[PDB]
Swiss-Prot record:
Protein's organism: Saccharomyces cerevisiae (strain ATCC 204508 / S288c)
Any further remark recorded for this protein: The active site is a conserved redox-active cysteine residue, the peroxidatic cysteine (C(P)), which makes the nucleophilic attack on the peroxide substrate. The peroxide oxidizes the C(P)-SH to cysteine sulfenic acid (C(P)-SOH), which then reacts with another cysteine residue, the resolving cysteine (C(R)), to form a disulfide bridge. The disulfide is subsequently reduced by an appropriate electron donor to complete the catalytic cycle. In this atypical 2-Cys peroxiredoxin, C(R) is present in the same subunit to form an intramolecular disulfide. Present with 1840 molecules/cell in log phase SD medium.
Function noted in UniProt: Thiol-specific peroxidase that catalyzes the reduction of hydrogen peroxide and organic hydroperoxides to water and alcohols, respectively. Plays a role in cell protection against oxidative stress by detoxifying peroxides and as sensor of hydrogen peroxide-mediated signaling events. Has a role in telomere silencing, which is the repression of chromatin structure which leads to a stop in the transcription of nearby genes. Also has a role in the regulation of telomere length. Acts as an alkyl-hydroperoxide reductase in the nucleus during post-diauxic growth.
Span of the entire protein shown here: 59 to 214 of 215
Quaternary context: Monomer.
Top-level EC class: oxidoreductase
Protein name per its UniProtKB record: Peroxiredoxin DOT5
TM annotation in the entry: none
Similarity field: Belongs to the peroxiredoxin family. BCP/PrxQ subfamily.
Induction line: During the diauxic shift. In response to oxidative stress.
């Protein structure tokens, strides 16, 4: 869209529903956690999305000492909940059917429909890593490297 986020831009002051149908404020997540990872997948419960979500699950015990982690897609709350429960995800999945946040992050597939596998890391409420169109493996591996990089910078 016209208002696409770039490095240094604040997180959009929007709220999205998690898999339990509870509203999560994007600003409040980034206020409570120095680092937040949003990973975007096209559709819940597909081989591609399962690979990405499961790698974040497998990294979660480690990452949760650095960052909050959220999955994000255009799926309904009920689709997100089925995905979360089947895959035993320890982090939340956010529903964005209008691709409002997905849009601003730069991850729409076409103006009309769909999302592109991506991830986005915010530090102190501002966009720090912007990874659009990557594989499930690259998303999982690079998100961890990037999170660890920014945590290192805090030591000064």
């Amino acid at each position: 869209d016209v208002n696409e986020l770039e490095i240094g831009d604040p997180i959009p002051d929007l709220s999205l529903l998690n898999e339990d149908n509870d509203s999560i404020s994007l600003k409040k997540i980034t206020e409570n956690n120095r680092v937040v990872v949003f990973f975007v997948y096209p559709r819940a419960s597909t081989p591609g999305s399962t690979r990405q979500a499961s790698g974040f699950r497998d990294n979660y015990q480690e990452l949760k000492e650095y960052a909050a982690v959220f999955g994000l897609s255009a799926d309904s709350v009920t689709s997100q909940k089925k995905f979360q429960s089947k895959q035993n995800l320890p982090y939340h999945l956010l529903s964005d059917p209008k691709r409002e946040f997905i849009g601003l992050l730069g991850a729409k597939k076409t103006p009309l429909s769909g999302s592109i596998r991506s991830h986005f890391i915010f530090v102190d409420g501002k966009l720090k890593f912007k990874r659009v169109k990557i594989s499930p493996e690259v998303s999982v591996n690079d998100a961890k490297k990037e999170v660890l990089e920014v945590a290192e910078k805090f030591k000064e």
